Amino acid sequence: SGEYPTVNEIPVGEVRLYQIADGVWSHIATQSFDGAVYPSNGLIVRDGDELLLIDTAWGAKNTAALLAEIEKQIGLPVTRAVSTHFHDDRVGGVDVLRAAGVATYASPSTRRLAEAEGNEIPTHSLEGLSSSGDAVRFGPVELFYPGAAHSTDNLVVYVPSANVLYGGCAVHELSSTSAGNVADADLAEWPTSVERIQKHYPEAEVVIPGHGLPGGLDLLQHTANVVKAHKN
Ligand SMILES: C[C@@H](c1cccc2c(-c3ccc(CS(C)(=O)=O)c(F)c3)c(C(=O)O)[nH]c12)n1cc(CNC(=O)[C@@H](N)CO)nn1
Ligand SMILES: [Zn+2]
Ligand SMILES: [Zn+2]
Numbered sequence: 553s554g555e556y557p558t559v560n561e562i563p564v565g566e567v568r569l570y571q572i573a574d575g576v577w578s579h580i581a582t583q584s585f586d587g588a589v590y591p592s593n594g595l596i597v598r599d600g601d602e603l604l605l606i607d608t609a610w611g612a613k614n615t616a617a618l619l620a621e622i623e624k625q626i627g628l629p630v631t632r633a634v635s636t637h638f639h640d641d642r643v644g645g646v647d648v649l650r651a652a653g654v655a656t657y658a659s660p661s662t663r664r665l666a667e668a669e670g671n672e673i674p675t676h677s678l679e680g681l682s683s684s685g686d687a688v689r690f691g692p693v694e695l696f697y698p699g700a701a702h703s704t705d706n707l708v709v710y711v712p713s714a715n716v717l718y719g720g721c722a723v724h725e726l727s728s729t730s731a732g733n734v735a736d737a738d739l740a741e742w743p744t745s746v747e748r749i750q751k752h753y754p755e756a757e758v759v760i761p762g763h764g765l766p767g768g769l770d771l772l773q774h775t776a777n778v779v780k781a782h783k784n
Contacts, residue, residue: 576598604693657674
């Protein structure tokens with residue numbers, strides 16, 4: 553009833569939306585992985601009379617539920633989606649999107665990693681993002697490759713109209729006491745990648761992590777802190 557959604561409000565298979573700013577929502581869903589339940593976030597950005605989706609809802613049935621929730625709450629068609637790295641919380645559901653007519657995109661690095669891991673593969677390759685510090689425009693957002701962090705391919709997304717920074721899984725929530733699932737991470741490079749984000753988007757007003765509660769710019773420094781404590 554207005555607070556940011558959590559698993560206790562989200563059974564696995566359900567999706568809730570949260571208004572972040574004018575024309576910007578996050579989506580929240582829950583999924584089980586290795587016998588534990590996790591929330592995860594994505595983004596929705598209004599693109600005139602269409603919508604741009606950032607990340608799936610972590611699974612085929614969750615992503616179908618996401619589309620139904622968007623139709624209920626917003627009522628504009630999702631025409632394009634970008635996945636911000638290769639893990640199932642970002643690409644699991646791309647097949648559902650593609651069968652619902654959504655054009656799916658990711659960097660070539662994400663597409664190769666997804667293919668090698670056996671995860672769903674976005675259709676279209678996003679060039680111009682292969683070097684750290686690169687940025688490209690994609691509808692109403694900017695896509696930015698900060699360097700390796702949570703994964704080698706992770707992208708962040710900025711909504712300039714609203715100064716919303718969607719950090720994806722390279723950014724953790726303030727309450728986090730650990731650095732999440734780091735199996736594919738570069739813990740040594742991650743702080744440098746976070747510093748690049750901080751330098752590029754100093755006017756960000758909302759910062760959204762890949763999992764957990766949005767906050768402000770403090771999430772970036774907190775992420776560097778929890779990652780450093782993990783490495784050590
Ligand atoms: C699907 C993804 C995955 C699944 C389950 C959990 C997560 C987490 C995670 C975990 C804990 C917290 C709370 S916290 C910050 O307080 O710690 C959190 F916020 C996010 C993240 C992430 O951090 O983004 N992502 C996860 N995922 C990752 C991998 C890597 N590979 C493996 O795990 C191998 N065993 C192969 O299976 N594969 N899928
Ligand atoms: Zn991940
Ligand atoms: Zn994640």
